[PDB]
Amino acid sequence: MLSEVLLVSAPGKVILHGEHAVVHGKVALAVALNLRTFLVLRPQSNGKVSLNLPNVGIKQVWDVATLQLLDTEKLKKVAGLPRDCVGNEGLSLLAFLYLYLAICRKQRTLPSLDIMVWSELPPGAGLGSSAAYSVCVAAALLTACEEVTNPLKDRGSIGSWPEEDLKSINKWAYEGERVIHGNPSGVDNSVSTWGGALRYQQGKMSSLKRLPALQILLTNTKVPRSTKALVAGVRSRLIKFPEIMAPLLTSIDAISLECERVLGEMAAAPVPEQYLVLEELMDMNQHHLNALGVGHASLDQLCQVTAAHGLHSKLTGAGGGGCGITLLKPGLERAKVEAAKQALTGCGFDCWETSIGAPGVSMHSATSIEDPVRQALG
Amino acid sequence: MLSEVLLVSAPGKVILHGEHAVVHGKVALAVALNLRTFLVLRPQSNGKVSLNLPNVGIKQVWDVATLQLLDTEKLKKVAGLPRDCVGNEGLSLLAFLYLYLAICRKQRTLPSLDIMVWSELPPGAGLGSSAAYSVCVAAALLTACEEVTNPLKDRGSIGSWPEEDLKSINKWAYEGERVIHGNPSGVDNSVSTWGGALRYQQGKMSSLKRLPALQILLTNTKVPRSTKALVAGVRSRLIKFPEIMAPLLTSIDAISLECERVLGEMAAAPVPEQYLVLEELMDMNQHHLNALGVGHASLDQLCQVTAAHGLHSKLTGAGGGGCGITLLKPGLERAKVEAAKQALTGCGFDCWETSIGAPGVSMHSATSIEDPVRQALG
Numbered sequence A, B: 001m002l003s004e005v006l007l008v009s010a011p012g013k014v015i016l017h018g019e020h021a022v023v024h025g026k027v028a029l030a031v032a033l034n035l036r037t038f039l040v041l042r043p044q045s046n047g048k049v050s051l052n053l054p055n056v057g058i059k060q061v062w063d064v065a066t067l068q069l070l071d072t073e074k075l076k077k078v079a080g081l082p083r084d085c086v087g088n089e090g091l092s093l094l095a096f097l098y099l100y101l102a103i104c105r106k107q108r109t110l111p112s113l114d115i116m117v118w119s120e121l122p123p124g125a126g127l128g129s130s131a132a133y134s135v136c137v138a139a140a141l142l143t144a145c146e147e148v149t150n151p152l153k154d155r156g157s158i159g160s161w162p163e164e165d166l167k168s169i170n171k172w173a174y175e176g177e178r179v180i181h182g183n184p185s186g187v188d189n190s191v192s193t194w195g196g197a198l199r200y201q202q203g204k205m206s207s208l209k210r211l212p213a214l215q216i217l218l219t220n221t222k223v224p225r226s227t228k229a230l231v232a233g234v235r236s237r238l239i240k241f242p243e244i245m246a247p248l249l250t251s252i253d254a255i256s257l258e259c260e261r262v263l264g265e266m267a268a269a270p271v272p273e274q275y276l277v278l279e280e281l282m283d284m285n286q287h288h289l290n291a292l293g294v295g296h297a298s299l300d301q302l303c304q305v306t307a308a309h310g311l312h313s314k315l316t317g318a319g320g321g322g323c324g325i326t327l328l329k330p331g332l333e334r335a336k337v338e339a340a341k342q343a344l345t346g347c348g349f350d351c352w353e354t355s356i357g358a359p360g361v362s363m364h365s366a367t368s369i370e371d372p373v374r375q376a377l378g
């Protein structure tokens, strides 16, 4: 057990290319979104572990005494420890407990902690915020129970864990996603742990070696959608017009592959003509997705406003609403981008200017933390 | 030679599906557009043949005496008969003369005629108005010199020529398109002659046996474009992203083929669910074309306004401007369609509510002719 206060942060994700094509065997590219989730863990004296989730406005307190006397599927039983009430986010408090016991069990006394979680990620918008949360939790606990090295052992500003350690973090982050999702693939938590870019084919994942600096505008239309529905309609259209749909899917597959090739050649020396290829790829993937049938008026609107300012975008994820991405290459005029944001907001959409291909699980010194975050954390 | 006044009309064309895909070996569907070109031929006494083209504001008069004394490549020589001045539409007056001599030569005296041509077709917008013109000319002359039966020999209201006769009309209509275009494929003139729908693969054409009643909105954005440019950019992108583009083209090919199948099954009994397939096909072909790169802001705008009213459209032809088509299925409310037209016009576009799969070369009695047409003709 450590004593110092731990501060860890993990990024969310966006599907650059591949969205619906992956369901049919095609390649997809998932990348770390720099909209992070922070978790501050404070050691305590009182025999109580308190998990505090501001966002979802819920706080829960357990007393080590009771949990320490609990006999250590498994889920049903776990629910009999805290309770069983309302909350789609109630599974999270269940995912915390699981991660808490299973990881600290090898301790001769369950520690008394205080966890503070606050992210910049909009929940449910498909940016994998629950994995970012699981990763943060598994990372803080693992470090507190010294099951993993302490990145800031040398009192650095910002730090990360070594490969062997990141693997332990992911494995545990995954169990936590299993409890809340049931059958998660592992892309979300893998993206949150290793950061950077991920390649997903048919159950197999890899980590693109090197990525360039990519600036984007993340837009949330707040339009609610049914992921189960979209995927069904696509499969439906795949059955109705097979000779039309089959090729289309292959076309999207080629877009992921092409992007993979370019990003790699950009990691060398980013020539301006490389951003031109990327936006052409986005333009085409957006049209293909509209063809698949997962488009939405709020999304055509997002692209229309954006193109009006010379920017290129594409939906990201399930389509039919949700978020969209817009590329910001090196050289645009502060004015073009600034107006797009205003326009986007006027439509009633949330808009963030962030980055893609983000760092990954990180430990921060309380002085590396910005002000807005520090205010929400302490 | 006949004596009565002849009145013939021919339809233009629109590419339902296939546009850029045909250049690469894929199937395309061309259909007769019910925006007709009329030609009134009046026999005269004075030894003069007068061709009058109101639209292009030009009239030309020749005297049979001079032409009758002309020794009967060949083009250069033909130009030495009238003259050689300005006019992209000057080749037309040249196409008339060629059709006049070559067809009346077997007469012992060049007749004295008066031709009046007036169409509802916008020139150069890709609706094949020059073929509609060549067809009308070849049809009037052929009938006057009795090289073909007289449809209204039985004093009917409206009539057409028999297969064997329509073939002669097309063959001559083609020479006239050769003079004005140089290397025309024959789709335009074949569509204008036989009407209905045509299937074009790789030099081979066929006539879809039966088509259903299709109502559409023809929209001209009046945005000028370069057909030579568009096709070049497409070939360019085909070279740059081959694994992405190849499949896409195959996807469009499947759209033509699918449409061909449905139209045929609609000719039986047009079930409402058949119009649903057609608009899904248009939606998809429009997205593919945007992917090819032949889209334009004026066209996204055309589709956006239209969808706002529940209607489905797609560009038609070269893209990057020009015309677009919108389907009007049986059952829409006069209000939805009427507002679309207003909106379209506000954008500064010309809009026509016509039909597709039109009749073809026809002879009309001066009482079958509407008022607007009759006013412009006499």
Ligand SMILES: Nc1ncnc2c1ncn2[C@@H]1O[C@H](COP(=O)(O)OP(=O)(O)OP(=O)(O)O)[C@@H](O)[C@H]1O
Residues within 6 Å of the ligand: A037, A053, A055, A056, A088, A089, A090, A091, A092, A117, A118, A119, A122, A123, A124, A125, A126, A127, A128, A129, A130, A131, A133, A180, A188
């Ligand atoms: N800051 C946060 N604090 C606590 N729980 C969170 C936070 N952000 C997300 N979650 C939890 O994760 C769940 C999100 O499930 P959801 O199906 O929407 O997946 P997602 O992670 O939002 O993204 P995606 O489905 O693409 O992965 C919620 O049930 C919620 O309890």
Ligand SMILES: Nc1ncnc2c1ncn2[C@@H]1O[C@H](COP(=O)(O)OP(=O)(O)OP(=O)(O)O)[C@@H](O)[C@H]1O
Residues within 6 Å of the ligand: B037, B053, B055, B056, B088, B089, B090, B091, B092, B117, B118, B119, B122, B123, B124, B125, B126, B127, B128, B129, B130, B131, B133, B180, B188
């Ligand atoms: N009503 C008309 N009267 C006389 N000439 C016409 C008329 N309509 C079209 N034309 C002639 O046909 C030519 C049109 O050439 P163009 O390359 O624009 O082909 P198009 O027939 O308009 O359509 P598309 O190119 O798709 O076939 C002009 O040079 C013009 O002289």
Ligand SMILES: [Mg+2]
Residues within 6 Å of the ligand: A128, A129, A130, A131, A132, A177, A188
């Ligand atoms: Mg998740």
Ligand SMILES: [Mg+2]
Residues within 6 Å of the ligand: B128, B129, B130, B131, B132, B177, B188
């Ligand atoms: Mg023509």
